[PDB]
Design a protein around this ligand. Structure first.
Ligand SMILES: Nc1ncnc2c1ncn2[C@@H]1O[C@H](COP(=O)(O)OP(=O)(O)NP(=O)(O)O)[C@@H](O)[C@H]1O
Length: 519
């Protein structure tokens, strides 16, 4: 069995041929643009057909999604046509899984937590409980896009990636940009606009680039690291056109090294768009029992990775991590000592260095995060929300001395006692009622003594936009799903009631919530 693949979901259009052996017999790729696809698709198909012959192809596979609406219609048309013009089977393929899969083949990684970054995508995905599941992602635009968009504005040539990274190697000043991480996801729009205005403010180009890099990349690495720990994967992989970046690679390895997990990037040929990744995943799904009707290859630009029935893995899942008990923070945000002060049981909380990041950024990140945590932990007392008392804060050392709350954290009780989901609701409501935003709502954030306390506020912002309050709930929703999956519908339908009894504007934000969960 041997297959031909057609790739063209945006700018590039590529085609390739792979054996069942995993041998790339041919793979080529040249750079609306949907016209530019049908323009050169047949040019490539010819060139392929020189090196391998038409009548020995057994499958056609094509990139079914996710992707750019119009330009997907074209690629599908080309492949739909050519399948019949050979009287041979055709199957549709998930773009993202193809990336992760051709990685597996050409790095001898066997099962990674993979970061997929490019112009149109920014996802961390891992094969967990039978399906290819998404862990953290961009809430607005892909790093690839954020970069290009900045490149154009600053008038650099377009595929903006390489140029920003060049100029970045000359950069001395680390300029102030937002670091926005919302739970397990990230946003870029801010970062982007804030680079734009800094350019405007006459910061020097080299400095802006360096900083837009360090920022963006750091975000991705935190988002990746976080995700890693909701896994026992022993290996991280990095796929997509943005993987070309040496500095991103650089960061990631450091994070990886410092978490005892080996790190993979696949060869240029299979790193960005290409027909050969499409050929393989087709060949892989088909080899093991998937056939597809001509009616079943309808285009879907929204294609999640869970939408696909993984039937090509059955083997030993490679190299895994061991998850011990109360065992120390190897790559943890905080170091927590227990202590006494004025005969009060007390916590000293320190935000340690993160070895992968640039020290300047690191010093700012842990500096900002502790201050904010002191700011809001105290502030939030004015709204009747039980919280530890801030006894002392220390910005040169990133230390906070605060009250010790004896009890169990929501996570360990919430399932059996549902009232505990309600009390979370009420706090969030009270936060939202006061235009205060937690950016990391989770059941490990709250401790229950006689009442329920927030114990973390490291990423709080004051904002009064309904949008921010809706994504607040969306981070918590995902948290509840990822850690209390089986008892979700209960916990969520109860949490809402706690938020109901407390915020009047609840519908306007719950309605806006159901809006974002579709964009
Ligand atoms: N050295 C680099 N540093 C940073 N970004 C880069 C670099 N080289 C390329 N890129 C970015 O990578 C993106 C192109 O990769 P590519 O995978 O072709 O994107 P795509 O068209 O969205 N395909 P896909 O990855 O399948 O979604 C562009 O947005 C580039 O700006």
């Amino acid at each position: 069995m041997i297959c031909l693949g057609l790739e063209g979901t945006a700018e590039k259009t590529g085609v390739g041929i792979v054996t069942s052996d995993g041998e790339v017999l041919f793979n080529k790729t040249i750079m609306e643009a949907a016209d530019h696809h049908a323009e050169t698709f047949p040019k490539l198909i010819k060139e392929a057909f020189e090196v391998v012959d038409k009548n020995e192809i057994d499958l056609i596979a094509f990139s079914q999604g996710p992707g750019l609406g119009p330009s997907l219609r074209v690629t599908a048309t080309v492949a739909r046509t050519l399948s019949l013009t050979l009287k041979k089977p055709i199957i549709g393929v998930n773009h993202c899984i193809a990336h992760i899969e051709i990685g597996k083949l050409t790095t001898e990684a066997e099962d990674p937590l993979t970061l997929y970054v490019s112009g149109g995508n920014t996802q961390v995905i891992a094969y967990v409980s039978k399906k290819y599941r998404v862990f953290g992602e961009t809430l607005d635009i892909a790093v690839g896009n954020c970069l290009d968009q900045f490149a154009r504005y600053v008038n650099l040539p377009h595929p903006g990636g390489p140029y920003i990274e060049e100029l970045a190697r000359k950069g001395k000043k680390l300029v102030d940009l937002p670091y926005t991480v919302k739970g397990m996801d990230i946003a870029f729009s801010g970062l982007l606009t804030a680079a734009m205005r800094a350019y405007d403010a006459g910061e020097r180009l080299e400095d802006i680039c360096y900083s837009l890099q360090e920022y963006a990349f750091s975000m991705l690495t935190e988002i990746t690291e976080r995700a890693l720990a909701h896994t026992n994967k022993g290996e991280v992989m990095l796929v997509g056109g943005v993987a070309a970046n040496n500095r991103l690679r650089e960061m990631l390895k450091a994070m990886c090294e410092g978490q005892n997990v080996d790190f993979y990037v696949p060869p240029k040929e299979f790193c960005g768009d290409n027909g050969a990744m499409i050929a393989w995943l087709g060949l892989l799904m088909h080899k093991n029992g998937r056939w597809m009707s001509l009616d079943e290859t309808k285009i879907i630009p929204n294609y999640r990775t869970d939408m696909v029935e993984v039937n090509w893995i059955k083997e030993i899942k490679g190299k895994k991590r061991k998850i011990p008990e109360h065992l120390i923070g190897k790559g943890a945000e905080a170091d927590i000592k227990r202590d006494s002060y004025l005969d009060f049981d007390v916590i000293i909380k320190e935000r340690v260095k993160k070895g992968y990041r640039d020290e300047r950024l690191d010093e700012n990140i842990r500096k900002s995060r502790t201050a904010r945590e002191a700011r809001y932990l105290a502030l939030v007392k004015d709204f009747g929300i039980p919280a530890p008392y801030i006894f002392d804060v220390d910005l040169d050392n990133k230390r906070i001395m605060m009250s010790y709350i004896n009890g169990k954290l929501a996570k360990d009780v919430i399932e059996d006692n549902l009232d505990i989901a309600y009390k979370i609701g009420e706090i969030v409501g009270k936060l939202h009622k006061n235009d205060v935003i937690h950016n990391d709502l989770t059941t490990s954030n709250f401790i229950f003594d006689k009442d329920l306390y927030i114990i973390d506020f490291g990423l709080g912002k004051i904002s009064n936009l309904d949008e921010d309050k809706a994504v607040d709930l969306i981070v918590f929703k995902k948290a509840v799903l990822s850690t209390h999956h089986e008892k979700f519908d209960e916990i969520w339908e109860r949490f809402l009631e706690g938020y109901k009894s407390v915020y009047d504007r609840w519908e306007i934000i719950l309605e806006l919530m159901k809006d974002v969960e579709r964009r």
